[PDB]
Amino acid sequence: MNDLNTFVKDAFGRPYIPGSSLKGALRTAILNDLKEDTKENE
RNA sequence: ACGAGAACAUACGUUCUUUGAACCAAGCUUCAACUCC
């Protein structure tokens, strides 16, 4: 009935949000033009 | 009964002296620990 998923923590065991997460969020927000933006978008 | 007989082209002597396989150059670029029920 219980299966816990915990938050990401650094080596000191004190949590933080990595910057790749926020860049993924802003990339999802910016890319509301057409889905043509590949892995060499400047 | 030879323009012949006898006679080492031999002795000595460092392929050696000086000389950076160097100079320049981000293991980096783009990525949501995630979706479904």
PDB file of N, CA and C in Angstrom, chain A residues 14-32:
ATOM      1  N   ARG A  14      20.906  16.808   1.603  1.00  0.00           N
ATOM      2  CA  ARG A  14      20.068  17.982   1.808  1.00  0.00           C
ATOM      3  C   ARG A  14      19.551  18.438   0.447  1.00  0.00           C
ATOM      4  N   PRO A  15      18.235  18.444   0.245  1.00  0.00           N
ATOM      5  CA  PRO A  15      17.682  18.433  -1.115  1.00  0.00           C
ATOM      6  C   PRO A  15      17.820  19.756  -1.850  1.00  0.00           C
ATOM      7  N   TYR A  16      17.692  19.654  -3.169  1.00  0.00           N
ATOM      8  CA  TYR A  16      17.873  20.742  -4.119  1.00  0.00           C
ATOM      9  C   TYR A  16      17.268  20.310  -5.442  1.00  0.00           C
ATOM     10  N   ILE A  17      16.928  21.279  -6.284  1.00  0.00           N
ATOM     11  CA  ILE A  17      16.446  20.997  -7.633  1.00  0.00           C
ATOM     12  C   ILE A  17      17.615  21.203  -8.591  1.00  0.00           C
ATOM     13  N   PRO A  18      18.005  20.199  -9.371  1.00  0.00           N
ATOM     14  CA  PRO A  18      19.088  20.397 -10.335  1.00  0.00           C
ATOM     15  C   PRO A  18      18.655  21.304 -11.474  1.00  0.00           C
ATOM     16  N   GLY A  19      19.639  21.959 -12.094  1.00  0.00           N
ATOM     17  CA  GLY A  19      19.353  22.934 -13.134  1.00  0.00           C
ATOM     18  C   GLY A  19      18.861  22.332 -14.430  1.00  0.00           C
ATOM     19  N   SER A  20      19.138  21.047 -14.659  1.00  0.00           N
ATOM     20  CA  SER A  20      18.630  20.378 -15.850  1.00  0.00           C
ATOM     21  C   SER A  20      17.114  20.277 -15.812  1.00  0.00           C
ATOM     22  N   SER A  21      16.545  20.122 -14.613  1.00  0.00           N
ATOM     23  CA  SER A  21      15.097  20.097 -14.448  1.00  0.00           C
ATOM     24  C   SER A  21      14.475  21.414 -14.879  1.00  0.00           C
ATOM     25  N   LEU A  22      15.062  22.523 -14.434  1.00  0.00           N
ATOM     26  CA  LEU A  22      14.497  23.823 -14.753  1.00  0.00           C
ATOM     27  C   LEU A  22      14.696  24.150 -16.223  1.00  0.00           C
ATOM     28  N   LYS A  23      15.823  23.724 -16.805  1.00  0.00           N
ATOM     29  CA  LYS A  23      16.009  23.943 -18.235  1.00  0.00           C
ATOM     30  C   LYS A  23      15.031  23.114 -19.054  1.00  0.00           C
ATOM     31  N   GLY A  24      14.713  21.901 -18.601  1.00  0.00           N
ATOM     32  CA  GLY A  24      13.693  21.121 -19.281  1.00  0.00           C
ATOM     33  C   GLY A  24      12.323  21.765 -19.210  1.00  0.00           C
ATOM     34  N   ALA A  25      11.996  22.353 -18.057  1.00  0.00           N
ATOM     35  CA  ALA A  25      10.731  23.068 -17.923  1.00  0.00           C
ATOM     36  C   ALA A  25      10.668  24.286 -18.834  1.00  0.00           C
ATOM     37  N   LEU A  26      11.707  25.124 -18.819  1.00  0.00           N
ATOM     38  CA  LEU A  26      11.707  26.292 -19.697  1.00  0.00           C
ATOM     39  C   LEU A  26      11.830  25.913 -21.162  1.00  0.00           C
ATOM     40  N   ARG A  27      12.417  24.764 -21.475  1.00  0.00           N
ATOM     41  CA  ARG A  27      12.469  24.344 -22.867  1.00  0.00           C
ATOM     42  C   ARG A  27      11.091  23.910 -23.340  1.00  0.00           C
ATOM     43  N   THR A  28      10.356  23.205 -22.476  1.00  0.00           N
ATOM     44  CA  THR A  28       8.963  22.876 -22.755  1.00  0.00           C
ATOM     45  C   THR A  28       8.115  24.139 -22.890  1.00  0.00           C
ATOM     46  N   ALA A  29       8.429  25.171 -22.108  1.00  0.00           N
ATOM     47  CA  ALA A  29       7.679  26.420 -22.210  1.00  0.00           C
ATOM     48  C   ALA A  29       8.037  27.222 -23.462  1.00  0.00           C
ATOM     49  N   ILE A  30       9.317  27.279 -23.828  1.00  0.00           N
ATOM     50  CA  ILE A  30       9.757  28.016 -25.008  1.00  0.00           C
ATOM     51  C   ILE A  30       9.327  27.351 -26.311  1.00  0.00           C
ATOM     52  N   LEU A  31       9.299  26.022 -26.364  1.00  0.00           N
ATOM     53  CA  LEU A  31       9.120  25.318 -27.628  1.00  0.00           C
ATOM     54  C   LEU A  31       7.679  25.257 -28.109  1.00  0.00           C
ATOM     55  N   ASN A  32       6.805  26.175 -27.695  1.00  0.00           N
ATOM     56  CA  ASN A  32       5.452  26.197 -28.242  1.00  0.00           C
ATOM     57  C   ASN A  32       5.359  26.897 -29.595  1.00  0.00           C
TER      58      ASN A  32
END
